[PDB]
Design an enzyme around this catalytic site. Structure first.
Site, mmCIF file in Angstrom:
data_model
loop_
_atom_site.group_PDB
_atom_site.id
_atom_site.type_symbol
_atom_site.label_atom_id
_atom_site.label_comp_id
_atom_site.label_asym_id
_atom_site.label_seq_id
_atom_site.Cartn_x
_atom_site.Cartn_y
_atom_site.Cartn_z
ATOM 1 N N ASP A 45 0.808 -1.144 -0.051
ATOM 2 C CA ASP A 45 -0.010 0.038 -0.046
ATOM 3 C C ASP A 45 0.834 1.260 0.100
ATOM 4 O O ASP A 45 2.036 1.316 -0.655
ATOM 5 C CB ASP A 45 -1.036 -0.041 1.134
ATOM 6 N N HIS A 86 -3.508 5.010 4.221
ATOM 7 C CA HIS A 86 -4.246 4.052 3.823
ATOM 8 C C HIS A 86 -3.771 2.536 4.089
ATOM 9 O O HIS A 86 -4.374 1.849 4.851
ATOM 10 C CB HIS A 86 -4.586 4.124 2.539
ATOM 11 N N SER A 260 -11.582 -1.211 0.792
ATOM 12 C CA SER A 260 -10.190 -1.286 1.318
ATOM 13 C C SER A 260 -10.089 -2.187 2.625
ATOM 14 O O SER A 260 -9.302 -2.625 2.908
ATOM 15 C CB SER A 260 -9.591 0.162 1.533
#
Ligand SMILES: [Ca+2]
Ligand SMILES: [Ca+2]
Ligand SMILES: [Ca+2]
Ligand SMILES: [Cl-]
Ligand code: NA
Ligand code: NA
Ligand code: NA
EC number: 3.4.21.75
Lengths: 473, 4
Positions: A45, A86, A260
């Site tokens: 990520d 994230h 996600s």
């Protein structure tokens, strides 16, 4: 007697356990003794806050790298907009530390957690390949909550280096048992996107994971497609709860959302399952998911019973993951036989599509040969076709056992005139069926326009074995 | 392209 976590936000982690049955049955796995000890998960990520108070205790430098800046340290790049939060949010879902007075807990709160910083820069094929292929004899499970654009017009998949990384991973990774790749199925619901137009989710080498809202509905962001394997909870409307995890700047968030959040929860459940049986292959793990996932009280208008009695949906695959059932079934699991591949070139001549095209072919599935398949795993319809407006096409594939897979639903925003170039549409919906018999491919124009095109190649590719079947559900 |  098992003692559940005391973390301050654990009571808000409604998806991990509850009396209501709207959960992933994770506490049952914990009570059986599985919390992820000895398993290594890596988040591919935008980085991981390795010093986060709820990640530091589980952080694993051997599971981490910075591909964007070419150094070992995956620490996120800090900005005012907190763009690079994230990966840290995904990591805490897998492996946030338990019983430490901070935030909540990971699904596998005793596993080791790393991150590859690879989205914060130009994401080339080489970047993806170096990430998917990182330390494959140390990392067991890779989690990817990213992929091609969800604009509902893109058709895009791994290029050569990334596909080579998938094949190397499943073949030689984890001591030859195979790297486990977990993928988020996408956020293109509002654009009516299809997750079969995403070659990462559509790959047989990834467990593509979709989402359900707290009240058991198909979230606004969800993409439907036949390649999805199973589901975990994530966010929905503003009356429905969301996901609790570690946030950038050493904070705790209760508002992680979207596709996600589902893949990391699945990665965590798979880590518990691997602890229960470290000898499981990459294919074994998909079999366990198929057999143990639960449709009950997930709402969809397309639930269908396949040829072996399992319910399957294009929104949810085989349903919600069930951690307690996964770890229980893993313990005495018998390794599946080696994977066979039966290639059937269907067409004898090109076929004009027009308003509607139906192609019927009876196949023997490599009868009499070493790649004879009586027990299907994945099936692909590898299609090459021209068309003037791609998103007006709907494509279905019907198995000999009568299971209708939607390979492609209409995509209103896909105006492309580029067609499909040997695109390997994949379905999980005929798993464990006997693929001998009549297959039917349907291609239709869903619009009133006078569209035109030609199907020039249709390869039916069957994967599976010839042994070990269960009595149908 | 590759989006979070
Ligand atoms: Ca760095
Ligand atoms: Ca904690
Ligand atoms: Ca998508
Ligand atoms: Cl292959
Ligand atoms: Na192998
Ligand atoms: Na997949
Ligand atoms: Na048959």
């Amino acid at each position: 007697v098992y003692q559940e976590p005391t973390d301050p936000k654990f009571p808000q982690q409604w998806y991990l356990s509850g009396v209501t049955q709207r959960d992933l049955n994770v506490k049952a796995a914990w009570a059986q003794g599985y919390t992820g000890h000895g398993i290594v998960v890596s988040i591919l990520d935008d980085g991981i806050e390795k010093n986060h108070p709820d990640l530091a205790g589980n952080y694993d430098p051997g599971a981490s790298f910075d591909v964007n800046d070419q150094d070992p340290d995956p620490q996120p790049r800090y900005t005012q907009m907190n763009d690079n939060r994230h990966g840290t949010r995904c990591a805490g879902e897998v492996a946030a530390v338990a019983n430490n007075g901070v935030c909540g807990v990971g699904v596998a709160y005793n596993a080791r957690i790393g991150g590859v910083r690879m989205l914060d820069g130009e994401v080339t094929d080489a970047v993806e390949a170096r990430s998917l292929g990182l330390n494959p004899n140390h990392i067991h499970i890779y989690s990817a909550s990213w992929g091609p654009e969800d604009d509902g017009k893109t058709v895009d998949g791994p290029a050569r280096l990334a596909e080579e990384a998938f094949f190397r991973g499943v073949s030689q990774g984890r001591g030859g048992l195979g790297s486990i790749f977990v993928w988020a199925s996408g956020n293109g619901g509002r654009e009516h996107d299809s997750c079969n137009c995403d070659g990462y989710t559509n790959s047989i080498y990834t467990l593509s994971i979709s989402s359900a809202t707290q009240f058991g509905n198909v979230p606004w962001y969800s993409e439907a497609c036949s390649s999805t394997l199973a589901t975990t909870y994530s966010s929905g409307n503003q009356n429905e709860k969301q996901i609790v995890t570690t946030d950038l700047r050493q904070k705790c968030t209760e508002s992680h959302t979207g596709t996600s959040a589902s893949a990391p929860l699945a990665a965590g459940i798979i880590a518990l399952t691997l602890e229960a049986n470290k000898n499981l292959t990459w294919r074994d793990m998909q079999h366990l998911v198929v057999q143990t996932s639960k449709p009950a009280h997930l709402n969809a208008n397309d639930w269908a019973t396949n040829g072996v009695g399992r319910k399957v949906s294009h929104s949810y695959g085989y349903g919600l993951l069930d951690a307690g059932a996964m770890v229980a079934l893993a313990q005495n699991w018998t390794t599946v036989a080696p994977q066979r591949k039966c290639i059937i070139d269907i067409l004898t001549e090109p076929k004009d599509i027009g308003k509607r095209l139906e192609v019927r072919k009876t196949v023997t599935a490599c009868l009499g040969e070493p790649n004879h398949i009586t027990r299907l795993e994945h099936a692909q319809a590898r299609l090459t076709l021209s068309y003037n407006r791609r998103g007006d096409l709907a494509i279905h594939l019907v198995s000999p056992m009568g299971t209708r897979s939607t390979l492609l639903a209409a995509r209103p925003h896909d105006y492309s005139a580029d067609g499909f170039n040997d695109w390997a549409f994949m379905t999980t919906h005929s798993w464990d069926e006997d693929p001998s018999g009549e297959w039917v491919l349907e291609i239709e124009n869903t619009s009133e326009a006078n569209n035109y095109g030609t199907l020039t190649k249709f390869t039916l590719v069957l994967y599976g074995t010839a042994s070990g079947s269960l009595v149908p559900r | 392209x590759x989006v979070x």
